[PDB]
């Protein structure tokens, strides 16, 4: 059994695949990870090198992707644009995969690359699997998109997905409904070819999304396999830990908005105003420059010296990559503020951190809903879309205060934390399924 | 400097012609949107749509999601025709989408099959409606008269007179056209009746080619005929570059028609008998490219090996415009579907006409009458009757042989060229049409 | 495999499983098979079954029909509303059938929807056939219901069909004898649409039902073909009989009440008590949910702790689904307790396993009658429609002991198995017809 | 300095030099400027200028598009269009643009681009207000007349003769017409238009564009020099008396034949003007040009070696024109050059070889900036005598009125350059409009 992982662009796409790959390797499959160059963000490149030196037996397959060529799919995002570039070049890898010395039994592809990858292994003896980065609830929305697009003539309230509670129209992203945009075209193109996949891997546990996992199973994606939460490859040298150790437990509030999400210039100053006003201890990851890490070459001239001095007693503001999974594990962090990209969300759940939900773009709003549903965190729907909306200091601060002091949440959040543990256990469903899956791989 | 939207109907024959026009309008400074629908019937349509847009970025594309097929009286057993029924129900979906188009629509060019439903869609909206017709004028004359024809017994009639043109033989009319329930008949009949509500009816033919019919249509209701043929290309060779000029015979039956297994064996045998170097495009999968998974298991292992010196046969989407243009090809064997015929004229390639179904027989006659190609009546309908290798062979040789025929096609080729010219009538008509659109 | 064949099963395991078997049989015999399914499936099991079929038999394509919203009133049955929701979307087979590459030479449609596809077989001239999943004697009663329900509609000791042993009214379901019930309308209307069919296949042979084959032949079904017993499909597993290996041959009683739950909880317990008294070693597959796989969430709350412990070393209980055919085939199994669903009855005869008959509902009672006549099993008539009467453990125990020690039955039962094989063998009568039908089909 | 801006010129120094000045001007006004360039660059000089510009301005970022596979300058302008999508990644990774200012030639391709990555876009024209309208009114004119007449009229603009108009622009078939006509149509998308002009130079011209639907035209002329400092070159410049030197530059490309060029070379010595001559060998390409000063002849060099100096290659024009020594300018009349002359107040003689320039010569005449002879016409068409030239050449040196008229023009240019004046005011305003 030889298994190959093909992640797309983004640390949200990259991190999950590497994490699984390490898990697969630990459980004894021969694992190859497919990377292509160049990569959009510095972290992906730096990470890949670190991952491989830590895991030596995993093979690295590197292919330089063809120069960006396109027609259609209006895209204004660098990570999405790279995904299109990888997808248009996946068909040129057929010659290489055919001749590999230890031939691949199966490929675990990225959702975005599933259509091109499914065509690629058509006449090769390789099972095709897809790993889903996002939540199961978002997958229900993805499955319903053709039905949603066909019967979506009216802009009114929410659409009832068939086996679970109806989602508000505000939660569905406007880009998803426009067929011209890449987000919609890629979502639609991949769901059509999901039927050619042997199994679809998900990063949620049965306890976390019982309705969403069950609804998809009866809605035609009958091969769904929950394997979440994914485990860290625990490879790390740089220590940014020291300030936290000084902090009392649970005092600190962690704010981060993912790998490639940035706030408005008015929002960065209003969020900073709220952090001061709240009086809470905090850790802020500032990603003012934007998605790309390389072009975000600025160095804390977003707030000014005046602000740092006021907050230094209660806060540390870090601009750069931070070891998020480690920070979350720390006794000091009792709160998290998230765009609710799923991988952060899953981590918050595994480590039991209360979450304050703040979607900016795409699936974040629905995932925010899941986060609210499970008690993981508090979500304010009225806030709506970050990047489409601005929230003042008064509003932000009160919520920040409220999350820090909800004991019901802290108690509730822990319960999810326990459930995530059970699933990893040998009895627990998620590990068992993977163990079940792994055997399958041997053919 | 106006917004005009073009809405095609299912199939390549109905899709390629619309795209070529959309590109053509864009060339002349028109803002253009193309209203496509999902999902497609065929891979080619989907593939072509994507390519077109990458090549003509200025052109907008509008995507519609199909409703499910709906029970209606009509009898249909064809995948493409069925899709047409589905697209037709779906037009009403359009209403809210039209009210928000970035630049307000000046007019919408709709398909003949989609004309009845589209005309009602914008009856209230201040939008001029035009329709573009895939088939020939000669067929069109038959279509216009169908509603009258539907009420007359017309049985045991060898031939039926058409009002300002000579009567078509019954032989060249599809039986299903004259049975009211069948979709083919119903869609043609229903749409003609609504034609009055269209400002103009665009036909992919030119005055030199179809002059008698073009007048004939005009004097019987449809005075809004605007021939602007032949539509330009919006925009397998390696074997060909090796070939001698004119030495190659090209066989194709279009994007949505396949030949019976018994018939197919005979055709290959004829090609072997003929000895003409040939490029044969084979569709064994009846109609669908997605479902035509068979890969030359149709001819046999032995067959190709013998024919390798004198032939190349492919199963797959050939580029028809480029193959015809190439110097080598000396004849076309065609179902005589109009778009194919129209490209045949443009490149002055002699055609041996073998209509298979539907409009094709009337079209076939125009091919012969024009002197473009030779058609034998006795062969009648393909997919209804099968003809021998021996008969097929003589005819295949003859088209290659005839030099008068080669000369005749050239006159057809020049006339086609003439219409394109700024002086020429068809190019002039499109421009006149363009002026009219009023923002 | 030149000829192109599609079989369409609408709903229920009993309907679904035989059709898959016919499909497998056709492919083995040189047809190219498409299998049509309608989603969402009523039960998890059909879906479980279908996915495995396609993965196990990969040269057979899967054609799915997505069902439309339904809302009719007059809650009946979940498989009867699904049988009528498949007829509310049976015009969605038009686009699919027109697109199929090698066009259909013949389609085999479940008898529940033969009246709705009539129009579809005229437009696209598909020679259509249908496979009956009931007994040949119960199909006779189904096939004469229209002519019997024209005359005085009432109940007598025995109602008679033309040329076969009169059927008692205690074997006939009461809802079939009232002409204003849903049931009759669907049966009367689909027997009228049997004249448009080119052949009618049934899952039986002529040694098993000699009179029914001729009674059905001399009463309006001259194109009836008995192709029984249907062959078994593959599944790849077996961690269901660790105890079965330890148990001695022919010593184990297999209790199955079919795809769905049968008797009331109170009644079952008496059998459980009954099983204990008998001493029969047993493998029991219990379906808690009387009709839905998805709905059944009960476990050890059906029989009580009291029983499960006492039989701990002598019998095992499996909740949910088991591979019934593989189990019966096992050397260990020596008796069968059945609800006498017809499909189950034909395999018992096919596998030569002795039956104790406990028909619960519907056609099962007539099947019980067939089992008796064949000499396949022991049947008690007075036990009655399920839940009609409560049967004491002592009465149940005696029949069970009688089944274990009844030698003539084994001899007769052994004799039935040889005949079933005889039909399957290439010279065989049932085998001959299936081979013949393919010969007729035209490319 | 909050606002962040990017410039994009495809080809020619006709466009790049102005764009860069636009880039520098924008940086001065508090704008984060990114300059986008196309590679490989057609000319070694074009490449040469860019490296210097970034190096001279550290704080202006450079973003580049590598290019995928008639006139080289026109064809390349065509190539940039092919690869325009390549722009898409670049915009996505930017540290996002408040606006982009793009070349006229490729505006049509970008329209799709602007709409997906929402960026307000502008174009800056390197041609005169009178000529832009001829481009601007061209599309209607071509379809309506389809004929050749001695003079043509742009609605509120005094008709200029066909003789000025370039022949290729006239032909419908020609590639040039498609580019010009198409692009103006695309002109609708832009939230502003900029031309290197001031109202005073062409009140009539600017108005017609305002009248004619180019409502959004903004004239920001003259553009400030983006320059190097300080090189000890032209010791031959400092030496001479004020206004003693005639500087000759026919372009950023060659313009006339060796025999036609020889007549001016012979005319120059008869004229007696001291001169600094910029002589380019390549008709259109600096890399292509590998000829020494043998078109003029050995003899010419020996005779005049004290009198004047000849530079083969490139020189800094603004730097040279600004000098006290320069009192006369001979120009091929490319607008960028013409504008430089007005801002520097140096009398011009107009000898336009090709294209827009003859119309540009007309503007000079209305202005009083320089002396022009219409009859000389399109370059290489006719041979103009050495004797005929000198009389005009001497006249340029010794005309008192011209000096006065020229003096005003420089004065007029400044007033717009200063804070009160409109060209300065609009720049201030546009930047203000720009939204973070
Ligand atoms: O400064 C950062 C930002 C993100 N992450 C990691 O990036 C992962 C993926 O982020 P997510 O998917 O939550 O958001 P996205 O980047 O996809 O929008 C998370 O697990 C974080 O651990 C990190 O380690 N440091
Ligand atoms: O393999 C093919 C088949 C079709 N065509 C083009 O498809 C168009 C449609 O053909 P037509 O409508 O005449 O036949 P139909 O598709 O209607 O049966 C014609 O322009 C052909 O040139 C092609 O280029 N390659
Ligand atoms: O637990 C089970 C129950 C049934 N079956 C099979 O599925 C069919 C269902 O039985 P039947 O239709 O005779 O009874 P019903 O469906 O009416 O309850 C039979 O062929 C059995 O062989 C099985 O494999 N496992
Ligand atoms: O030797 C030379 C020739 C030209 N230019 C510059 O060329 C630019 C643009 O020239 P213009 O567009 O007027 O002429 P063209 O490029 O059309 O020939 C002006 O800014 C001049 O300063 C220069 O600096 N040195």
- Assign domain B3-233+417-436 to its CATH superfamily: Glycogen Phosphorylase B; (3.40.50.2000)
Q: B83: nearest CA in chain C? A: C95
Ligand 3 atom nearest residue C285's Cα: 1
- Strands D151-154 and D157-161 come out as antiparallel
Does the C242-420 domain belong in CATH 3.40.50.2000? yes
Given a contact cutoff of 8 angstroms between Cβ atoms, the answer to whether B315 and C123 are in contact is: no
Pairing of strands B277-281, B225-227: unpaired
Strands (E), C128-195: 128-132, 158-159, 167-168
Q: Which ligand 3 atom is the nearest neighbour of the CA of C325?
A: 22
CA C380 to chain centre: 21
Are B58 and D111 a contacting pair at CB < 8 A? yes
Beta carbon pairs, B and D, within 8 Å: 8
Judge: D117–A265 Cβ closer than 8 Å, yes or no.
no
How many whole angstroms separate alpha carbon D286 and alpha carbon D252?
A: 8
User: Which ligand is nearest the CA of D17, by number?
Assistant: 4
Atom of ligand 3 nearest to the CA of C344: 13
Q: Which of C316, C312, C325 is nearest to C243 (CA)?
A: C316
Determine the Cα angle at A348 with ends A345 and A349, to 5°.
90
**CB pairs below 8 Å between A and D: how many?**
46
Q: Which of B72, B88, B68, B87 has the alpha carbon at shortest distance from B182?
A: B72
CATH topology of domain D248-411: Rossmann fold (3.40.50)
Ligand 1 nearest-atom number relative to CA A285: 1
* CA neighbours closer than 13 Å in the CB half-sphere of residue D316: 19
Q: Which of B268, B253, B209 is nearest to B357 (CA)?
A: B253
Minimum CA–CA partner of D84 in chain B: B57
Given this chain, do its domains A2-233+421-441 and A241-420 carry the same CATH topology? yes
The Cα of B78 is separated from the nearest Cα of chain C by a number of Å equal to 6
- Whole-number Å distance between alpha carbons of B347 and B230: 11
DSSP state for residue B93 in the 8-state scheme: G
Residues of chain D positioned with their CB less than 8 A from the CB of B3: none
> Tokens for B367?
């091919």
Spacing of C-alpha A290 from chain mean position: 17
Which CATH number applies to C3-233+421-440: 3.40.50.300, 3.40.50.2000, 3.90.1580.10, 3.40.50.2300?
Answer: 3.40.50.2000
B58 and C CB contact within 8 Å: no
- Which of the ligands is closest to the CA of residue D283? 4
Distance of alpha carbon D15 from alpha carbon B434, whole angstroms: 35
Q: What is the CA radius of gyration of chain B?
A: 21
Q: How many residues does chain C have?
A: 443
CA distance linking residue A437 with residue A227, whole number of Å? 10
Number of neighbouring beta carbons within 10 Å of residue D186: 17
Give CATH for domain B236-416. Answer: 3.40.50.2000
CATH class of A2-233+421-441: alpha beta
Q: Is A155 left (phi over 0), alpha (psi -120 to 50) or beta?
A: beta
C contacts of A435 (beta carbons < 8 Å): none
Is the minimum CB–CB distance between D188 and chain A shorter than 8 Å? no
What burial letters (b/e) apply to D370-407, b meaning 16+ CB within 10 Å?
bbbeeebbbbeeeebebeebbebbeebbeeeebeeebe
The bound ligand whose nearest atom lies closest to the alpha carbon of D21 is 4
CB contact under 8 A, B288 and C99: yes
Q: Calculate how far, in angstroms, residue C259's C-alpha sits from the geometric centre of ligand 3.
A: 5
Give the domain ranges of chain D.
Answer: 3-225+412-433, 248-411
**Chain centroid to CA A159:** 24
Residues contacting B23, CB < 8 A, separation 6+: B52, B56, B59, B232, B234, B235
CATH code for the domain defined by D3-225+412-433: 3.40.50.2000
Q: Do residue B293 and residue C94 have CB atoms under 8 angstroms apart?
A: no
C343 pocket-lining for ligand 3 (C-beta < 6 Å):
yes
- Minimal Cβ distance to D92: which of A70, A78, A296: A78
- DSSP-based three-state secondary structure for B83: helix
Please answer yes or no on whether A179 and B55 come within 8 Å at the CB atom.
no
Q: Do D112 and B1 touch (CB under 8 A)?
A: no
Q: Compute the distance between CA of residue A72 and CA of residue A37 in angstroms, rounded to an integer.
A: 24
- Strands annotated E in B112-188: 128-133, 159-162, 165-169
Residue B159 Cα, gap to closest chain D Cα (Å):
49
DSSP label at B118? H
- Cα(A367)–Cα(A357) distance, rounded to whole angstroms? 9
Mutate to test the interface with C, among A147, A150, A218, A224 (most CBs of C within 10 A): A218
Q: Show the beta-strand stretches assigned E in C167-311.
A: 167-168, 199-202, 224-226, 252-256, 281-286
Q: Please, what is the angle between helix B207-218 and helix B403-420, to 10°?
A: 70
Rounded Cα distance, B401 and A435, in Å: 72
Neighbours of chain B (3+ CB pairs under 8 A): A, C, D
Six token digits for residue A408: 């019901």
Asked if residue B40 lies in contact with residue B46, where contact means CB atoms within 8 angstroms, the answer is yes
- Strands (DSSP E) contained in A270-328 are 281-285, 315-318
A439 is catalytic: no
Q: Is D11 in the pocket of ligand 4 (CB under 6 A)?
A: no
Smallest CA–CA distance from C43 into chain A, residue: A218
**D vs C contact (3+ beta-carbon pairs below 8 A):** no
Method of determination is X-ray
- Level-2 CATH architecture, domain A241-420: 3-Layer(aba) Sandwich (3.40)
- The string over B64-87, giving b where at least 16 C-beta atoms fall within 10 Å of a residue's C-beta and e elsewhere, is bbbeebeeeebbbbbbbbbbbbbb
- The resolution, in Å, is 3.0
CA dist., res. D423 & res. D425, Å (int): 5
Q: Is B297 a catalytic residue?
A: no
Q: H/E element holding B185?
A: helix B183-193
Specify the length of chain A in residues: 443
Residue B103's nearest CA partner among B59, B65, B64 is B59
Cα angle, residue A424 at apex, residues A422 and A426 outer, rounded to 5°: 85
Total H helices, total E strands in chain B? 18, 15
Min Cα distance B28 → chain D (Å) is 10
Pocket residue to mutate for ligand 3, from C134, C258, C260, most atoms within 8 A of Cβ:
C258
Bridge pairing between strands C377-379 and C31-39: unpaired
């Amino acid at each position: 059994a030889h298994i190959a992982l093909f992640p797309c662009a983004g640390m949200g796409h990259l991190l999950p695949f590497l994490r699984l790959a390490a898990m697969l390797d630990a459980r004894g499959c021969a694992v190859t990870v497919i990377t292509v160059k160049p990569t959009v963000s510095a972290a992906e490149s730096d990470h890949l090198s670190a991952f491989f030196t830590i895991h030596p037996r995993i093979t690295r397959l590197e292919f330089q992707l063809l120069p960006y060529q396109k027609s259609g799919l209006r895209n204004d995002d660098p990570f999405f644009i790279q995904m299109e570039t990888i997808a248009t070049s996946v068909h040129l890898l057929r010659p290489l995969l055919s001749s590999l010395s230890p031939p691949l039994s199966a490929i675990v592809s990225d959702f975005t690359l599933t259509s091109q990858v499914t065509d690629l292994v058509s006449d090769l003896p390789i099972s095709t699997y897809t790993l889903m980065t996002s939540s199961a609830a978002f997958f229900c929305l993805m499955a319903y998109l053709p039905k949603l697009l066909q019967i979506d003539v009216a802009n009114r309230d929410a659409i009832e997905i068939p086996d679970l509670g109806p989602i508000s129209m505000s939660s569905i992203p406007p880009k998803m409904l426009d067929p011209s945009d890449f987000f919609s075209a890629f979502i639609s193109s991949n769901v059509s070819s999901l039927h050619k996949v042997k199994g679809v891997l998900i990063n949620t546990f049965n306890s976390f999304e019982s309705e969403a996992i069950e609804a998809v199973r009866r809605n035609g994606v009958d091969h769904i396999l929950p394997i979440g939460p994914l485990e860290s490859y625990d490879a790390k040298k740089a220590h940014d830990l020291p300030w936290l150790d000084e902090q009392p437990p649970e005092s600190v509030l962690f704010v981060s908005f993912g790998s490639r999400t940035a706030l408005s210039k008015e929002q960065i100053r209003e969020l900073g105003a709220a952090l001061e006003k709240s009086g809470c201890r905090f850790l802020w990851v500032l990603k003012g420059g934007k998605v790309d890490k390389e072009d975000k070459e600025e160095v804390e001239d977003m707030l000014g010296a005046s602000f740092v001095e006021r907050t230094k007693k209660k806060g540390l503001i870090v601009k750069g990559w931070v070891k998020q999974e480690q920070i979350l594990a720390h006794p000091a962090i009792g709160g998290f503020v998230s765009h609710c990209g799923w991988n952060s969300v899953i981590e918050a759940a595994r480590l039991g951190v209360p979450v304050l939900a703040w979607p900016q773009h795409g699936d974040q709003s629905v995932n925010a809903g899941v986060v609210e549903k499970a008690g993981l965190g508090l979500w304010v729907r009225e806030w709506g879309w970050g990047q489409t909306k601005l929230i003042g200091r008064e509003e932000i601060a009160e919520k920040m205060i409220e999350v820090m002091q909800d004991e019901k949440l802290r108690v509730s959040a822990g319960e999810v934390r326990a459930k995530a543990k059970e699933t990893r256990e040998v009895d627990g469903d998620s590990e068992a399924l993977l163990q079940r899956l792994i055997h399958s791989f041997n053919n």
